[PDB]
Design a protein around this ligand. Structure first.
Ligand code: HEM
Ligand SMILES: N[C@@H](CCC(=O)N[C@@H](CS)C(=O)NCC(=O)O)C(=O)O
Ligand SMILES: [Ca+2]
Ligand SMILES: [Ca+2]
Length: 300
């Protein structure tokens, strides 16, 4: 049972300590705000929000197909954790720190804030197999929805949480297939607006460095706002998994209207986003855990 005051006696200043450290990280690299919330997402969708993703090793989740050469911000988490451990030795879990850092990243980026409930335990093992099953930018909308349903989330959560792509980057490798010969017909993805198509072809030329990135949100790259959804109405979503929320056949009577509603009301988007984040932060696999003192390895 989570509670915002679970550390009221054991670590009174936790919230402030984490906030100050997140602000320091964002000052050094603004993209880190995006990277941190993505870590929380990838943590919660595998063995629950138990910091299993932070564990190193030959069988680490960091090597899973969706995480390798992709997930980032591990050094920043170590720094935050070190500050918290200096202030309250062996008290706060890495799982909670990741949750708080995600919330702070949204807030410091102009997004909505919410009171985080604490008390999560850190897992004892990595689940690389499950991490390979994380949502893919290449799969159909129904497949993405099924992955959210599997962890007790739903369609509304899919659309609202996809809004996190209102900031951050995505490498050429996960969207360049939409730029030249998307289906074998020799044409780019027909749902991609031509001016964006032109800019992306410049960023991702055939045979070039596929690790170069482009902003997920072409209007306000670092500001957390509903501009992500406005992009979709114009066919300017970067990943196929973004644009299908508006343009796919399945979206018509499912996600399409939600995308249009968030575009009309940022307050609505912010309300649903906070709601979905809290729900995602409540995912647990019920396995035994502990308060991990070094996020990269178990205590014993
Ligand atoms: C709905 C299914 C989703 C898919 C298919 C997906 C896919 C992706 C992909 C392929 C990237 C680029 C990775 C890279 O460049 O290596 C990315 C980045 C990102 N995703 Fe998602 N994502 C999804 C959901 C979410 C959710 C639920 C959140 C968090 C609440 C999220 C937050 C992020 C952020 C903020 C970035 C930027 C990371 C950075 O710049 O370091 N994503 N996502
Ligand atoms: N999914 C539940 C509702 C859960 C919920 O409250 N979801 C929030 C978003 S996080 C909402 O406003 N709508 C979701 C929904 O209607 O399912 C249901 O269908 O009764
Ligand atoms: Ca996890
Ligand atoms: Ca934005």
């Amino acid at each position: 049972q989570l509670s915002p005051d679970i550390y009221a006696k054991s670590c009174p200043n936790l919230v402030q300590i984490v906030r100050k450290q997140v602000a320091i990280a964002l000052k050094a690299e603004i993209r880190m705000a995006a990277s941190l919330i993505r870590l929380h997402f990838h943590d919660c969708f595998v063995n629950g929000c138990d910091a299993s993703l932070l564990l190193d090793g030959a069988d680490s989740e960091k090597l899973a197909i969706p995480n390798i050469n992709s997930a980032r911000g591990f050094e920043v988490i170590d720094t935050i954790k070190a500050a918290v451990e200096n202030a309250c030795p062996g008290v706060v879990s890495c799982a909670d720190i990741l949750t708080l850092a995600a919330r702070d990243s949204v807030v410091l980026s102009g997004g909505p804030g919410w009171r985080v409930a604490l008390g999560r335990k850190d897992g004892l093992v990595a689940n690389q197999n499950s991490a390979n099953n994380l949502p893919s930018p290449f799969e159909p909308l129904d497949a993405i929805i099924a992955k959210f349903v599997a962890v007790n989330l739903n369609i509304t959560d899919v659309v609202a949480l996809s809004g996190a792509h209102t900031f951050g980057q995505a490498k050429c490798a996960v969207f360049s297939n939409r730029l030249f010969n998307f289906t074998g017909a020799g044409n780019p993805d027909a749902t991609l607006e031509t001016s964006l198509l032109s800019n992306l072809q410049t960023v991702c030329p055939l045979g070039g460095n596929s690790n170069i990135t482009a902003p997920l949100d072409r209007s306000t790259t670092d500001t957390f706002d509903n501009n992500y959804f406005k992009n979709l109405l114009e066919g300017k979503g970067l990943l196929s998994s973004d644009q299908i929320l508006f343009s796919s056949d399945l979206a018509v009577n499912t996600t399409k209207k939600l995308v249009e509603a968030y575009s009309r009301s940022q307050s609505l988007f912010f309300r649903d986003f906070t709601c979905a984040m809290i729900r995602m932060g409540n995912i647990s696999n019920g396995a035994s855990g502990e308060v991990r003192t070094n996020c990269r390895v178990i205590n014993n």
